[PDB]
């Protein structure tokens, strides 16, 4: 520690906080693959319909 008034020379202050960036998980999926749902907790059931020729 300096024994003189070193705080006098602190003539500039920069504070690094960053920023809330986009999640990197978006890079692992195509835009069409992601679809939001309205839920907070529990279970949701999705039905896939299918067709075939007899």
């Amino acid at each position: 520690m300096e024994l003189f008034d070193e705080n006098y020379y602190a003539k500039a202050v920069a504070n690094i906080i960053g920023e809330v960036k986009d999640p990197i998980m978006y890079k692992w999926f195509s835009p069409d693959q992601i679809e939001d749902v309205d839920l907070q907790m529990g279970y949701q059931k999705t039905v896939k319909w299918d067709a075939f020729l007899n």
Binding site: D22, Y26, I34, D36
Partner: peptide
């Protein structure tokens, strides 16, 4: 926003818009 529920809905919509913008500006 009138209330906290509307504030939360606005936050979710903002997140969705950010995701859409990221995918539109992404170039692989």
């Amino acid at each position: 926003p009138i209330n906290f529920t509307e504030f939360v809905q606005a936050i979710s919509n903002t997140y969705k818009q950010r995701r859409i913008q990221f995918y539109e500006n992404l170039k692989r």
